[PDB]
Amino acid sequence: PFVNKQFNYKDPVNGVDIAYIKIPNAGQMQPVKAFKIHNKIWVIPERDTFTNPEEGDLNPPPEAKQVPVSYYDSTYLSTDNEKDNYLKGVTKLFERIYSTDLGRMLLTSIVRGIPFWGGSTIDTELKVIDTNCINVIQPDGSYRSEELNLVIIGPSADIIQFECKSFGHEVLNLTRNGYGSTQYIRFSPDFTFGFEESLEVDTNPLLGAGKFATDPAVTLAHQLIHAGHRLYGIAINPNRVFKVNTNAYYEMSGLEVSFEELRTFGGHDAKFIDSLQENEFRLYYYNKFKDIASTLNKAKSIVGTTASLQYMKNVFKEKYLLSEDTSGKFSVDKLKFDKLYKMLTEIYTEDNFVKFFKVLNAKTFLNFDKAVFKINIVPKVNYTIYDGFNLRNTNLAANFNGQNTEINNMNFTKLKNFTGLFEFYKLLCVLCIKVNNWDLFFSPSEDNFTNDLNKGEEITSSLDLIQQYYLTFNFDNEPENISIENLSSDIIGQLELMPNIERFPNGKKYELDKYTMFHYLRAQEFEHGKSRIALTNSVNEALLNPSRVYTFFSSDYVKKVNKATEAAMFLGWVEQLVYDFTDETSEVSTTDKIADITIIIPYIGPALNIGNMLYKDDFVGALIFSGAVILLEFIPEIAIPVLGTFALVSYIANKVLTVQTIDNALSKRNEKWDEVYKYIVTNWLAKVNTQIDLIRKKMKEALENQAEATKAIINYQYNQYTEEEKNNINFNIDDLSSKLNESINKAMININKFLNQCSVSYLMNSMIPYGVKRLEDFDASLKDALLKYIYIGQVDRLKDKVNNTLSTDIPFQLSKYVDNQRLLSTFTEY
């Protein structure tokens, strides 16, 4: 196990594994008790008031942070019992992460990744940096400095803001120049992020309603991935922000997401960056690693400890995986460094940890949080090492009911979040309404996507991979805690300076002439008023009178819900309403007049007002007329310029050299096809898939709103009765709620199928042909050039080979480019 001996906040100070410590700070701080849990890893069950002098208070600031959920409470982690609970939770979380294979990989890598000793001015001498060592005070009083790699401190006033911190150098960027530094992780195991999800309906038709609770193991794995990245000095510069346009009303106010976040999240999240930027980052960090190798080569002396040159040379060689030769020449081998970079960049990702834990979690960042939950995971009756919340041999093992906040009510408590539901907003009007900042579309800018297609080019002559990496990994030896000369009494250090993020303006007003989908979504909202709720089809009426609620069903539904009947036929009323709702939500129209669109669901038309046009049948007509363009709020700007014509190098009288040139030309032709396909797929994912995802989520929200509205109407009607009638009927609205939610799911599968078909048909009809035209022109410009190039020996055979190869376009295989069950499933039938 990771934690060898158990720790509690009552053990008297020892001086080896438990001790009062002092960490670097700008001023002077008092010693704080700390528990070492493994080699080079310590924990401080105290609130973060030491590393950040600016964060010297645990009270809510007047300006709320730009985070969808934030819980503030100064009382937490102030009592001894709370500290013991925190220590137990952290130990259990570390054990759970160490249980899995990928977690063991990550923990071994983090323990191995000791920072670099580049604090010396002499070009041939290595000296430890003060900002990477901490002091431990023995009971007698004589403190001793020690190295370390990780520190866990209870979060700051923002109790769920889990952001890694570090102490940098005056002129060096230790987090991105390959030097590395110890990472202080603000982690809290007693709180979790409670979000909603509806993508598991296909695999779990009996998926429960409500939100879901994120496993804290995933959050700790994310923070640990960030710490491991910053330990190896491969983090991306923070100014590389994923810029998003904010001028449009349908555009976000701002989403400060770094490229490091994209790299850490993994999965589809890692596909928002093009291959060019990834290659640039890889080459830049390769240059940094070779610089580090040269620095190791030129260094001859160690000052600060008794450790010899050989031991530290071996330690840093294991840290950076450098190919040192017989003469001690450390070189950055391309293959080993590439494997290490791939492992740290793509293997160590949140998506892989979600797959390994077998827990429900968000796939992209766009489905922001909605609640914060207080949890206790110290007792085994609530959370176990192996399975987590989804305990085995219970009713919570299947369908991920253990992580449900409505089924596992005993383990979760909904706390108050400080960020108001309409605290950050935009004012849209044509009745100026307030639309939440986190409910808006994600619009990437055109600058974030860069390509080298127009540049010329010259011709010369899954879990399986994780298992293989485990079989090829080593867990034999970890770096030792070598004695080091004591540092100063106070470690003077300053946190790494972060780039300033300008406050996004709040309450920007937009004047329009058409009804946005947000207006229609808001028109289907009520306030649980005691007065009778009336359904209507005019969105203007719903948005003016808050008692009225807009509905996109037929007039029969409105008539049926707007009538009045005594308790004699209410028993019939309930079943008629549930049957009509199930019928209308499950309605479908089949057509073949639009390519790749076999389902043309009409009621989407007036629900989200996608077509800017009232009639649903006219929406059917508009869809079969104009393809999947109507769904997208803003048409993405896809532009493939003229491809770089190949430059084959002539080789006179060397026939086999000519053959190698003609083979490399074909290979790079296929690779160019694949790369253009990948670029277009990335554009489709970034600019179109997010819009369809938001439309799907908003349609689910609208359906749930309609169900809640009709449920409120029937509840109000039932409340109007007498007590004897209520007892005789015994109308249990929970059963009807479950029935209507199941009808919502039965409609949701069809809605998912339709939207998946539309989002794949847009790629097949309006994005791929643009590239295919360019590459067909490229083939036309290449075949004649190659024919000129061949003008001795096997002339005829070469001509047949080239004509056969460039006669047909390479087939588009969506499987190799995007890995998702729904998209592949809908692409299969065509």
UniProtKB/Swiss-Prot annotation:
Metal-binding: is it a keyword of this entry? yes
Q: How is the cofactor bound?
A: Binds 1 zinc ion per subunit.
Q: Where is the active site?
A: 223
Region span, Translocation domain (TD): 431-830
Residue positions binding Zn(2+): 222, 226, 261
Kindly state which keywords UniProt assigns to this record, in alphabetical order.
Answer: Cell wall, Disulfide bond, Host cell membrane, Host cytoplasm, Host cytoplasmic vesicle, Host membrane, Host synapse, Hydrolase, Lipid-binding, Membrane, Metal-binding, Metalloprotease, Neurotoxin, Pharmaceutical, Protease, Secreted, Toxin, Transmembrane, Transmembrane helix, Ubl conjugation, Virulence, Zinc
Q: Which domain of life is it from?
A: Bacteria
Q: Which reactions is this enzyme annotated as catalysing?
A: Limited hydrolysis of proteins of the neuroexocytosis apparatus, synaptobrevins, SNAP25 or syntaxin. No detected action on small molecule substrates
Q: What biotech uses are recorded?
A: Dynamin inhibitors slow toxin uptake by nerve cells, and might be used to prolong the treatment window for antitoxins.
Family, according to the entry, reads as follows: Belongs to the peptidase M27 family.
Q: What is this protein called?
A: Botulinum neurotoxin type A
Underlying gene: botA
Q: Which residues of the full protein are shown?
A: 2 to 869 of 1296
